[PDB]
Amino acid sequence: ALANQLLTPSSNVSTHTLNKKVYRHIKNRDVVLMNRQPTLHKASMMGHKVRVLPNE
DNA sequence: TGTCTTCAACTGCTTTCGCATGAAGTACCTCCCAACTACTTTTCCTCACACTTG
Numbered sequence: 001a002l003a004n005q006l007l008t009p010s011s012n013v014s015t016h017t018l019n020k021k022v023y024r025h026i027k028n029r030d031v032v033l034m035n036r037q038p039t040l041h042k043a044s045m046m047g048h049k050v051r052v053l054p055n056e
Numbered sequence: 057t058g059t060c061t062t063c064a065a066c067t068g069c070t071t072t073c074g075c076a077t078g079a080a081g082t083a084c085c086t087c088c089c090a091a092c093t094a095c096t097t098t099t100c101c102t103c104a105c106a107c108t109t110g
Binding site: 037038039 | 072073
């Protein structure tokens with residue numbers, strides 16, 4: 001029922017400029033910042049492209 | 057009147073990030089509590105003596 005309401009029209013002039021938000025799960029198109037303690041250097045905390053692996 | 061020098065006392069830090077799993081102080085005091093035994097408590101039960109009789 002909510003899937004057919006994600007695109008509803010404006011309702012209040014207070015909110016007419018916004019659009020709804022969806023808290024989507026992390027997926028294969030997001031980048032994530034991996035850090036390993038040692039931080040000793042900036043190269044020890046890089047951004048990797050997320051690949052969800054099954055049964056991990 | 058003025059400026060200088062050493063020593064000892066005082067200040068602040070000296071790996072990061074998480075699991076465990078939190079527990080334990082205690083003197084002085086006690087009033088409450090649990091105890092053993094005896095004592096006490098409430099209802100009930102049943103008999104008994106004297107004067108008089110003949």
